[PDB]
Amino acid sequence: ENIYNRLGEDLNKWQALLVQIRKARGTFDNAETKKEFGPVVIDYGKVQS
Amino acid sequence: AWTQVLLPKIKNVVHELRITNQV
């Protein structure tokens, strides 16, 4: 409801935020489960599903 | 011989099924 009130009657209703939410899907929804970066590896395995 | 092998060294072809944006 906070989101609804903040973006009450945007371009149509939001018409922008939903677009970046699709872009916000990055670093997520990918076959990769653990982000490697050199000797530091972070595994988003438990949180993935 | 290759045909009956299909049914001669043969490479193993692989492909996967995945889902993205719930597709």
Interchain proximity B21–A25, CB inside 8 Å? yes
Resolution, Å (one decimal) = 5.0
Q: Do B21 and A31 touch (CB under 8 A)?
A: no
What is the C-alpha end-to-end distance of chain B, expressed in Å?
40
Q: Distance (Å, rounded) from C-alpha B2 to C-alpha B21?
A: 40
Question: What does chain B come to in residues?
Answer: 23
The string of DSSP letters for chain A reads: -HHHHHTTT-SSSSSSHHHHHHHTT-SSSSS--EEEETTEEEE-HHHH-
Taking the CA of residue B17 and the nearest CA in chain A, the distance in Å comes to 11
> From the CB of residue A17, how many other CB atoms can be counted at a distance below 10 Å?
14
**Tokens (6 digits) for A24:** 């916000």
Q: Which two tokens stand for residue A46?
A: 């438990």
Question: What is the Cα–Cα distance from A22 to B3, expressed in whole angstroms?
Answer: 47
Experimental method: cryo-EM
> How far is CA A19 from each of CA A14, A15, A16, A24, A27, rounded to the nearest angstrom?
9, 7, 5, 9, 16
Q: What is the DSSP letter of B20?
A: S
